[PDB]
Paper text:
Here, a novel and rapid method to obtain experimental phases for protein structure determination by vanadium phasing is reported. Vanadate is a transition-state mimic of phosphoryl-transfer reactions and it has the advantage of binding specifically to the active site of numerous enzymes catalyzing this reaction. The applicability of vanadium phasing has been validated by determining the structures of three different protein–vanadium complexes, two of which are integral membrane proteins: the rabbit sarcoplasmic reticulum [name]+-[name], the antibacterial peptide ATP-binding cassette transporter McjD from Escherichia coli and the soluble enzyme RNAse A from Bos taurus. In order to test whether vanadium can indeed be used for experimental phasing, we collected long-wavelength X-ray diffraction data from three known protein–vanadate complexes for V-SAD phasing: two membrane-transport proteins, the antibacterial peptide ATP-binding cassette (ABC) transporter McjD from E. coli and the rabbit sarcoplasmic reticulum [name]+-[name], and a soluble enzyme, bovine pancreatic ribonuclease A.
SERCA is a larger membrane protein of 110 kDa that belongs to the family of P-type ATPases. Its function during muscle relaxation is to pump [name]+ from the cytosol to the sarcoplasmic reticulum at the expense of ATP hydrolysis. In contrast to the tetrahedral VO4 form bound to McjD, the vanadate species bound to SERCA has been modeled in its trigonal planar VO3 state, mimicking the pentacovalent transition state of dephosphorylation. SERCA–VO3 crystallizes in space group P21, with two monomers per asymmetric unit, each of which binds one VO3 ion. The automatic structure-determination pipeline CRANK2 was also able to locate some of the S atoms in addition to the vanadium sites and built an initial model (1690 out of 1988 residues). The sulfur positions were essential to obtain interpretable electron-density maps [Fig. 1(b) and Supplementary Fig. S2], which explains why a higher redundancy of 77 was needed to improve the initial phases. Iterative cycles of manual model building and refinement, further aided by the sulfur peaks in the anomalous difference Fourier maps using the phases from the evolving model, allowed a full structure determination. The final structure had an overall all-atom r.m.s.d. of 0.6 Å compared with the previously reported SERCA–VO3 structure determined by molecular replacement. Analysis of the SERCA data sets showed that at least four data sets were necessary to obtain an initial model using the automatic phasing pipeline.
Numbering used by the authors: 1 to 278, 288 to 876, 880 to 994
Amino acid sequence: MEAAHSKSTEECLAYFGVSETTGLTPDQVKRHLEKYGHNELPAEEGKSLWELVIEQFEDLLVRILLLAACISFVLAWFEEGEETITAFVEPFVILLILIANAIVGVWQERNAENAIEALKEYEPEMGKVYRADRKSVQRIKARDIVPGDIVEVAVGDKVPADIRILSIKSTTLRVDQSILTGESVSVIKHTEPVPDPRAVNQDKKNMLFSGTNIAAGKALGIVATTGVSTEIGKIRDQMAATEQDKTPLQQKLDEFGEQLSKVISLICVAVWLINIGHWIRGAIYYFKIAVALAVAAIPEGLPAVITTCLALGTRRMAKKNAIVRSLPSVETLGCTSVICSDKTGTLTTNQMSVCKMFIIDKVDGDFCSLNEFSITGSTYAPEGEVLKNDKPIRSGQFDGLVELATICALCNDSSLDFNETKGVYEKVGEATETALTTLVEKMNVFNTEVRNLSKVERANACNSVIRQLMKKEFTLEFSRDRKSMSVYCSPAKSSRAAVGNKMFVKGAPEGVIDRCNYVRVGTTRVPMTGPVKEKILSVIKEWGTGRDTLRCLALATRDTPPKREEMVLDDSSRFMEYETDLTFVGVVGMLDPPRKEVMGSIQLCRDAGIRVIMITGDNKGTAIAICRRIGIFGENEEVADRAYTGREFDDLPLAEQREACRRACCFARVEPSHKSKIVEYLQSYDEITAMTGDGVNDAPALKKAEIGIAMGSGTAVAKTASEMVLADDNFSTIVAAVEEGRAIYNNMKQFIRYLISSNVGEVVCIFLTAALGLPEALIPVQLLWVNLVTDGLPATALGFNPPDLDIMDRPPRSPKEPLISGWLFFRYMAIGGYVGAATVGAAAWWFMYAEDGPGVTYHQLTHFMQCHPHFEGLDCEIFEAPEPMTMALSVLVTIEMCNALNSLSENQSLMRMPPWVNIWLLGSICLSMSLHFLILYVDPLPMIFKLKALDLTQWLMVLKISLPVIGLDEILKFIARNYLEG
Ligand SMILES: C/C=C(/C)C(=O)O[C@H]1C(C)=C2[C@H]([C@@H]1OC(=O)CCCCCCC)[C@@](C)(OC(C)=O)C[C@H](OC(=O)CCC)[C@@]1(O)[C@H]2OC(=O)[C@@]1(C)O
Ligand SMILES: Nc1ncnc2c1ncn2[C@@H]1O[C@H](COP(=O)(O)OP(=O)(O)OP(=O)(O)O)[C@H]2OC3(O[C@H]21)C([N+](=O)[O-])=CC(=[N+]([O-])O)C=C3[N+](=O)[O-]
Ligand SMILES: [Cl-]
Ligand SMILES: [K+]
Ligand SMILES: [Mg+2]
Ligand SMILES: [Mg+2]
């Protein structure tokens, strides 16, 4: 039954054809099951391990790096293998790296908890239905509840289906709908049809939504929808539907990878360009250079280096209490352009606070004076002080304030509890009432010593003094008609009727103040006149529709109550006349106040070019008032077309909506799906958006946003949906979390540039040793070992570079900003040209012009393949020698050690930026050298690798070749800052 909130109770009973008095039939329930299925959100299952590993292989660079590992296996099989059988295992290192880099990724994806299973925790197991099967109530499996069933709910029950209320058997039925509206105050339901067929859950006061739970009362209803078709079912349907996008950086690495897949295909054509005429050996040569061509092109270990860089940011962030569940999100938080954030529980403490209160002062003539007070503290904890005119006063010095707190402590069902496990006070009962309980604690009316109390005894210390002052005989409950409630108290002394027993009354100000024939002035009573009533009804309207928009409760007493045996308590309708001839005492103003640090944190995002949008299910006038307090709006700023309710927003034509999401800062009366749209719209303008929330109703927006941030105090659902938890609930840690993102990516830019322009030299070299007939090509094992650990250690040290000073004064980077720019392309083309020649020039220097180099002949080194009169006097097996290739390896090692010293800063001299500033960089160069020394001096490693040679002079030669790269860059660096300024 769709739109059941708008039809009558008879109409709903008629829609299915049932009476309340007797349920559905076994005939009906069987047919309904076959029509509507069972009552359950369907579980969503993760990917199988087979289908998870396969996803690692979809990337092209690993799809071609896999292809090169296979090609190596064949070459390993052939007699070059069998000449040196032990050292054919270079593919296994390739394969092992592909297996490792894939295994860390699957563990990244395998370790993950399900936010839909977290939602199904709101499905109750059992349900109470009346069916025609039997006369009594029937407790059955809630998944067997079909629509049209008659169901019953009492205190503490989870509502098992979306239910239209038929009969509220208690006085009020109070429901906790935080799962849909994000609010915590109990909603008072009714049975009258709500007509608008496009009313939001906040307006559907006659509905009971599956997942929500009953706070107080008992009710009977008829099921409107079961299973996925329910408001909570729409939440997960939009949660399973959303699909998280590719990181902007991972887009570039896919962009970059997609181009190597093409430029690798092209260099293989230029090798075949050797057709200038002006079989196993020929085959092996085409392949043995193709494999090394791929190994020299794709930056292996860059996935390894990137992973450990984020993993350390995860570790440093946890020091600042930001728990990062997804490692790729530590950089996307830097380019956050917009921050969408929930209100209650996020920007505010979600703890009702009594900010202001007043009582009468003077009443003479048409003049009426009020004592107005201010109460500090933004939490249920009894911490905070009462102020009059911003100077602290002692509440118990005002006789009117004594009565005000007595009414607050006695006309109250709520309590205060200190959770020793959590270390924080928690409400016991209604949020609205618990606020009054905390007020009495802050305003220690009878001056009870509370400094030495344990934290558990402090919770109710002051209320318990008042409880022992007067005995609470009975309580006239809250009822919808009068919007008021009362308690009947007897003095519990020997004075009895002389000191007199009293009625204490609290409720909506209009209803109470009408039934107030007197006005309390301290101890004395004065008749309620026109002027006095207006003066108090004036201030209430000011506190109601002001810059402080506060729910006001009127506190009155009845000094001469009716006779205890004269009042009947079966009937909630006589209660209003019972609460008559009252004496007005005072008024209190309530607010879920913003967290201490939220305001300043917003100003910091504004300073960093990040806007903040509030999106709340709370009433609009309240969200606007919290917005002014936070700084989203000005204190006197006339919000006009800048704050919309979900309905007003939905009423705009689709075109105007996207423009609204760019100019509007506040959104209220919002259903869960409304938040996901606004995120989606902001994303349509291609700015990275961040969603902060804590409730279940935020899980759609938390998933859609590129970066979800859940509060620690929030629901599990919200955490499971998001990529970051604020352990300490400190909103300031978001601003700090961004700073890390901006800083990391800057360092990521360096070690990506550093590791890539290292890869570009390995292709210039491998091409030179292939275009010209040079024997000495770098062996793939060297490129691997260097690109993995010899280049890995330095690149990771670029991750520790100092951050920029203005890092938080620049606007967010464009997500499509390219890493290698225009000149920086040339700068690395020139750097790539050098290191490409420096490794191949060493190769020739051994044979041609060296004392231990027997070859010489240069022109014959270029044509050494055939190997007799042209090769006479020289051994052919001397070209396989390991000594001529150490220079190539040691050139590349020393130049990339030096190129890493150029990577500590783009476009800036190291004469001006000494490597001292990054001490980590220098130590990492040492270990790559110390490990390089190891790969040259221990038989198991110089057998796979090359042998040390010309130690006295070769080392000088490599150091003599590697120096000009610092000058090449330092000249290119000076060319850069001379031209960038103009
Ligand atoms: C030689 C080794 C590599 C890995 C290579 O070819 O990378 C190219 C390449 C794919 C790009 C280029 C490289 O371009 C060249 O190398 C041009 C000359 C090639 C001839 C050499 C043979 C004689 C990078 C290396 O810039 C330079 C320094 O030339 C990175 C850059 O931006 C990045 O991808 C950096 C972020 C990872 C990309 O041009 C990139 O392609 C893109 O899609 C871009 C736009 O992104
Ligand atoms: N934003 C808020 N700030 C402060 N309080 C809020 C706020 N929102 C709701 N409440 C309190 O919560 C109860 C929720 O009832 P509900 O039907 O949702 O009423 P609304 O006034 O909110 O109409 P609305 O949905 O906004 O159009 C109300 O009952 C009472 O105080 C109200 C109430 N009253 O409204 O008059 C009287 C009362 N006693 O005891 O007299 C107890 C309440 N209570 O415990 O929640
Ligand atoms: Cl509203
Ligand atoms: K997300
Ligand atoms: Mg919330
Ligand atoms: Mg309201």
